[PDB]
Ligand binder design. Sequence first.
Ligand SMILES: CCCOc1ccc(S(N)(=O)=O)cc1
Ligand SMILES: CCCOc1ccc(S(N)(=O)=O)cc1
Ligand SMILES: [Zn+2]
Length: 257
Amino acid sequence: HWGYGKHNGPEHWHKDFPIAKGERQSPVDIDTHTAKYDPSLKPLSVSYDQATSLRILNNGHAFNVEFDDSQDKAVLKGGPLDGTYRLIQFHFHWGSLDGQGSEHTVDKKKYAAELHLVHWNTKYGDFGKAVQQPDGLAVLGIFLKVGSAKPGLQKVVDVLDSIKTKGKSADFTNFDPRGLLPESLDYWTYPGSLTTPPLLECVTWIVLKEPISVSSEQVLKFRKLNFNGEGEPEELMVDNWRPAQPLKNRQIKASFK
Ligand SMILES: CCCOc1ccc(S(N)(=O)=O)cc1
Ligand SMILES: CCCOc1ccc(S(N)(=O)=O)cc1
Ligand SMILES: [Zn+2]
């Protein structure tokens, strides 16, 4: 079973998921000087006003806040995207230390964590079909740095005690993901992949330039989660990030000057 340990971590993934060495793998380092401003890029449209969260799940790799994606309730459009992408879930990747945890890096800088809001292209009907398409998903990535608390994150933090171990879920309704965004929607974008197995090359990445601030106490609570199931040897859920992969034949575009 793949994971983030020494014996099943990112180095090993290629043996069961050979696409790990593919042509459009994620995450990548974002070289801010080499990224090119693309004036043809449109403003992102994030329309989360009708979002319906349902549940939070510890899946043994991270925790997912899941949404009702059976209607156009929370959608991402514009920017580099053609069509409409529906929010299905968000999750984070984080470190054991404030100095690491993000998947994308910015001029080699690692943030304490990275939020992924995962959306699927409605033209493919559902998430499972969408991941089989080169333009199936749009993932909005947001960096977390440690400083002031993010008030909109606290409801997530406070439920983590109830999903400590792999396979635990809890009702999680009425959560508003707008509370997790920074002020600016300036972004970088490039074609990539899921950052965990199956590592499918189905993602348009949209990574926001402005990080959000979360408190040390907030991230500390992420680090109390467990990779293991209940009754198994405990192993803290930390450093659940894949390192930057080769950019290969790709250009990162910036929405901003
Ligand atoms: C005895 C357990 C097998 O160990 C492994 C499980 C999963 C992988 S991976 N990361 O290729 O999918 C490797 C070894
Ligand atoms: C196809 C089941 C796995 O779904 C996902 C795996 C990883 C991501 S990430 N970390 O790239 O946003 C999203 C969906
Ligand atoms: Zn992710």
